Amino acid sequence: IEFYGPNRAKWLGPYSENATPAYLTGEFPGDYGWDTAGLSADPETFKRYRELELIHARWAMLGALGCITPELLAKSGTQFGEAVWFKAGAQIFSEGGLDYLGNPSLVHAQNIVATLAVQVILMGLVEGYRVNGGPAGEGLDPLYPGESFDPLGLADDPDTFAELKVKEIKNGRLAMFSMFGFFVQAIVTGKGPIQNLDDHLSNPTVNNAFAFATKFTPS
Amino acid sequence: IEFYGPNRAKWLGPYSENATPAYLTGEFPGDYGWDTAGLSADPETFKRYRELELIHARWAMLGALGCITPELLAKSGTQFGEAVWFKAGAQIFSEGGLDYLGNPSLVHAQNIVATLAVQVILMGLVEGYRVNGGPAGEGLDPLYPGESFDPLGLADDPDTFAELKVKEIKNGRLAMFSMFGFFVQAIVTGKGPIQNLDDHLSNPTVNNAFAFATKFTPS
Amino acid sequence: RPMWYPGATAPAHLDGSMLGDYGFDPLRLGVNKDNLKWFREAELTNGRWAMAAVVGILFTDAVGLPKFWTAGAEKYALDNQTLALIEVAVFAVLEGKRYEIYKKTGETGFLSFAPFDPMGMKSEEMKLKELKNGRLAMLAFLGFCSQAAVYGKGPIETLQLHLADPGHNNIYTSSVGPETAVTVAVLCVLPMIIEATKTLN
Ligand code: CHL
Ligand code: CHL
Ligand code: CLA
Ligand code: CLA
Ligand code: CLA
Ligand SMILES: CC1=C[C@H](O)CC(C)(C)[C@H]1/C=C/C(C)=C/C=C/C(C)=C/C=C/C=C(C)/C=C/C=C(C)/C=C/C1=C(C)C[C@H](O)CC1(C)C
Ligand SMILES: CC1=C[C@H](O)CC(C)(C)[C@H]1/C=C/C(C)=C/C=C/C(C)=C/C=C/C=C(C)/C=C/C=C(C)/C=C/C1=C(C)C[C@H](O)CC1(C)C
Numbered sequence: 001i002e003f004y005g006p007n008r009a010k011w012l013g014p015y016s017e018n019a020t021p022a023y024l025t026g027e028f029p030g031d032y033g034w035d036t037a038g039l040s041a042d043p044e045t046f047k048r049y050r051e052l053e054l055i056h057a058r059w060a061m062l063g064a065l066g067c068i069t070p071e072l073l074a075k076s077g078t079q080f081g082e083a084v085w086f087k088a089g090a091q092i093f094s095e096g097g098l099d100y101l102g103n104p105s106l107v108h109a110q111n112i113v114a115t116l117a118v119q120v121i122l123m124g125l126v127e128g129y130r131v132n133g134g135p136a137g138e139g140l141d142p143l144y145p146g147e148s149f150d151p152l153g154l155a156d157d158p159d160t161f162a163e164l165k166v167k168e169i170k171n172g173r174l175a176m177f178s179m180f181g182f183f184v185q186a187i188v189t190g191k192g193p194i195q196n197l198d199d200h201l202s203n204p205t206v207n208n209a210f211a212f213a214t215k216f217t218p219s
Numbered sequence: 220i221e222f223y224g225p226n227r228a229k230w231l232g233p234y235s236e237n238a239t240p241a242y243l244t245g246e247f248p249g250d251y252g253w254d255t256a257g258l259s260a261d262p263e264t265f266k267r268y269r270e271l272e273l274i275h276a277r278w279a280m281l282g283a284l285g286c287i288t289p290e291l292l293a294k295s296g297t298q299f300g301e302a303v304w305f306k307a308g309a310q311i312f313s314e315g316g317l318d319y320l321g322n323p324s325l326v327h328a329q330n331i332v333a334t335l336a337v338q339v340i341l342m343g344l345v346e347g348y349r350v351n352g353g354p355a356g357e358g359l360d361p362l363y364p365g366e367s368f369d370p371l372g373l374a375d376d377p378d379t380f381a382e383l384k385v386k387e388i389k390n391g392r393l394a395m396f397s398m399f400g401f402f403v404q405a406i407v408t409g410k411g412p413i414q415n416l417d418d419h420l421s422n423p424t425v426n427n428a429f430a431f432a433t434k435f436t437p438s
Numbered sequence: 439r440p441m442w443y444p445g446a447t448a449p450a451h452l453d454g455s456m457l458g459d460y461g462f463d464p465l466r467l468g469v470n471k472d473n474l475k476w477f478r479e480a481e482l483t484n485g486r487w488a489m490a491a492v493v494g495i496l497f498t499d500a501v502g503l504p505k506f507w508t509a510g511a512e513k514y515a516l517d518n519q520t521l522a523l524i525e526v527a528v529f530a531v532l533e534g535k536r537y538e539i540y541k542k543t544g545e546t547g548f549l550s551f552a553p554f555d556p557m558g559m560k561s562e563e564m565k566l567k568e569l570k571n572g573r574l575a576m577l578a579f580l581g582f583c584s585q586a587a588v589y590g591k592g593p594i595e596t597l598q599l600h601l602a603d604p605g606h607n608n609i610y611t612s613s614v615g616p617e618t619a620v621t622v623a624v625l626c627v628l629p630m631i632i633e634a635t636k637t638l639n
Pocket of ligand 6 (some may be wrong): 035039056057064084085086088089128176179
């Protein structure tokens with residue numbers, strides 16, 4: 001319970017090998033000391049990896065919640081068409097464009113190239129202004145700004161803020177691994193991941209994974 | 220209109236972020252300052268990238284004109300067999316070898332391994348003599364020699380020559396991107412790129428790209 | 439300091455220090471300096487939502503869409519039960535900062551991060567201009583709720599029913615009409631009594 005220090009929860013815990021690599025000893029969230037290949041020995045490259053892992057973690061957490069929500073919402077009390085995240089990307093082609101919430105009173109996007117061009121413009125703008133700063137105060141911190149992106153004001157107390165950092169990083173790692181699981185389920189069985197959830201909860205051991213183990217057999 | 224200077228046409232124009240990376244400030248053609256990842260920070264590696272990009276650009280421009288010409292010539296008034304660049308490589312196997320121009324009075328290459336061995340010999344010779352120099356004067360410049368490869372003498376006036384450098388680099392970038400387009404059209408639809416041109420000019424919006432968007436669907 | 443009836447007094451705590459201070463407080467509500475601190479933003483926010491409601495109430499009755507007193511009655515929207523629970527969480531979150539930013543700074547702003555001015559626009563003597571617009575708008579909203587009342591037509595439809603027409607169909611020739619005449623006659627003679635309170639001191 002001492003991540004910021006030598007007594008962090010190390011990568012093997014009780015098999016910790018307390019001779020840890022000396023280029024990271026606490027002082028940054030998520031430092032769990034698991035460097036078996038050591039591709040981040042250089043400090044500036046290590047900083048790049050911290051920034052890159054933060055970006056990946058936030059994007060993957062957003063994607064993971066985007067993979068949990070719509071299927072459950074269309075399963076409970078709404079209808080989307082194909083709420084499963086496969087053909088949600090092809091809902092613009094089918095009959096009447098991409099109607100949001102499955103309702104012909106919302107977005108109703110007909111042409112995907114317009115979404116395409118506007119998406120490129122907006123994403124270039126926000127990513128450029130993410131790197132070099134810009135609106136809502138010029139960006140002085142590349143990792144965590146501290147400017148008007150926290151309109152609630154939770155970043156006053158430092159140790160709770162650091163705990164929030166560590167929670168953010170751990171959540172991001174879990175999100176990345178889970179989205180990898182989503183992608184592998186997309187490849188192998190190619191069905192709904194929450195359909196997978198319901199089917200495994202209905203079938204705990206009879207259809208586990210290895211009925212779907214003789215599919216990609218070469219011959 | 221000031222590529223050789225601080226007032227070059229930067230990668231975003233009036234979204235230029237005039238705080239450009241300091242390891243390139245004009246003085247070389249094609250310097251558009253678009254370094255988002257920064258894989259060419261080292262100067263000798265940057266020189267390698269200039270040389271490599273020049274080689275890629277000239278090779279890709281040669282390939283792009285080689286992808287535009289023969290189909291048009293066989294569509295206008297000549298016949299080649301398969302003028303589309305897919306089976307032009309297999310025209311030596313079909314019935315009577317690779318007859319140039321679609322004429323049994325020209326190259327008529329029967330055995331492809333002879334082309335293979337002579338091509339390796341010639342290409343090793345020309346690439347080795349490209350690196351280290353040799354015939355027609357020893358190579359003193361790896362980027363642009365200035366020796367007897369310009370038999371017309373257009374490299375007298377310096378600023379027009381630099382403009383020619385910039386045109387060459389821009390044409391090469393366009394050629395590389397366009398040849399990437401050719402390869403992707405070879406993958407997805409697998410038909411003639413100029414057949415694609417004619418079909419899209421006949422069908423501007425009914426068969427655009429996304430009829431060919433449900434082909435590589437996993438299941 | 440132009441008072442609410444031409445030659446008037448000033449109640450002994452409505453001097454000219456407030457913004458829209460036309461010296462009107464006959465029932466002595468804000469006698470504190472602690473509720474003035476609060477009734478000011480009650481005034482500004484109650485008015486501010488109404489200023490944002492008048493635009494919608496006019497456009498929905500200019501363009502088409504079914505009349506506002508039956509707007510949510512029929513609804514092609516989604517899941518009447520739970521979108522109100524959506525309308526609870528974001529709001530309570532937002533209220534935390536509205537009341538918090540009310541507490542920590544002096545009586546002016548509200549948004550989550552700062553006194554909200556992304557522009558360099560007027561933060562000047564013209565806050566009386568928008569509270570003036572607001573106290574106009576609140577009176578404008580009650581009229582529309584009294585048009586969903588007695589006549590049952592919308593704003594612009596009764597605007598056509600009278601406002602190209604003479605004074606033959608107005609308040610006093612309508613259902614709730616004999617009471618308004620009495621209230622007009624009573625309110626008009628009222629400053630004539632308030633002057634008699636303070637003539638005899
Ligand atoms: C449109 C212009 C645009 C520009 C100029 C940038 C620019 C940048 N982005 Mg951004 N982005 C842009 C659009 C978008 N980005 C993102 C999402 C991200 C993320 C998630 C991240 C960035 C990052 C970065 C930075 C460097 C990334 C890089 O080297 O790419 C090179 C990469 C590729 C060309 C593709 C790599 C694919 C990857 C290997 C996936 C492999 C998949 C897995 C193996 C599993 C696959 C399936 C499963 C089932 C096995 C750079 C500043 C990174 C960063 O800021 O790090 C500090 C970062 O982490 N961007 C999205 C969402 C789709 C965009 C949509 O338009
Ligand atoms: C036969 C002996 C031979 C020798 C010794 C050389 C030697 C050399 N060549 Mg040369 N070449 C030779 C034959 C040929 N070359 C070329 C074409 C080129 C080019 C275009 C370039 C060189 C370059 C170079 C130099 C370093 C390239 C390297 O590291 O390769 C390592 C690379 C590979 C083993 C293959 C890389 C493939 C690449 C990743 C393609 C990826 C494709 C795309 C992702 C898209 C694909 C499909 C689309 C639809 C998506 C090196 C001096 C480069 C240079 O001089 O830079 C300064 C350079 O730019 N050569 C051709 C034409 C086919 C040859 C035919 O015989
Ligand atoms: C691309 C995503 C990515 C990146 C850049 C990083 C980056 C980092 N991680 Mg990390 N991590 C990730 C995803 C990622 N992580 C995921 C998904 C998990 C959960 C499984 C973890 C779990 C983890 C732990 C437990 C620890 C780190 C640590 C580190 C740091 C040092 C290691 C290093 O140099 O990594 C460089 C990484 C790369 C160059 C990425 C290469 C990716 C290629 C495609 C190979 C991946 C193939 C993969 C092994 C096959 C199975 C995939 C499946 C497991 C998902 C560095 C900041 C250590 C640290 O000190 O934290 C700060 C540490 O103790 N990570
Ligand atoms: C392999 C081909 C290649 C190579 C080596 C370069 C090399 C260079 N380019 Mg360049 N460029 C290319 C192709 C290439 N270019 C193409 C096709 C385009 C048009 C899209 C451009 C457009 C471009 C601009 C606008 C600018 C540069 C710049 C630069 C310089 C600094 C960037 C750098 O370090 O690149 C290193 C590059 C590599 C290590 C190549 C990695 C390739 C792998 C496979 C990843 C590619 C995946 C790709 C993103 C996926 C989509 C492909 C599709 C877009 C074709 C450097 C000399 C900057 C400069 O200052 O010019 C001198 C600059 O401003 N380039
Ligand atoms: C309901 C919102 C509201 C609120 C909270 C306030 C608050 C305030 N106004 Mg105010 N005002 C409003 C609406 C409001 N106003 C409207 C709509 C008008 C135009 C008609 C005015 C016109 C006005 C003037 C001209 C003056 C004020 C002043 C004041 C301040 C001191 C007087 C006081 O103690 O009031 C406290 C009042 C309340 C707490 C409101 C209680 C609500 C009662 C209990 C119910 C009212 C219902 C009503 C009688 C029935 C509907 C009426 C309809 C039929 C016409 C105080 C900050 C004075 C001031 O200092 O200048 C700014 C002043 O001179 N106001
Ligand atoms: C550390 C280390 C160390 C040692 O030494 C070595 C090694 C081992 C190599 C290393 C490792 C590495 C790794 C593992 C990595 C991984 C990563 C990942 C997983 C990522 C993800 C990542 C992921 C991500 C970002 C994601 C993202 C996502 C997204 C956006 C999504 C989107 C979406 C949505 C919303 C929904 C819809 O409907 C669709 C989609 C489209 C789907
Ligand atoms: C810059 C940067 C920056 C940031 O930072 C990062 C990143 C983004 C990564 C980067 C990018 C990169 C890139 C994009 C690259 C690309 C390239 C290319 C496209 C190449 C091509 C390239 C291409 C090329 C050479 C080509 C060549 C070609 C050829 C020879 C051809 C041949 C031929 C012909 C004649 C005809 C016949 O019948 C057949 C064939 C066989 C077909």
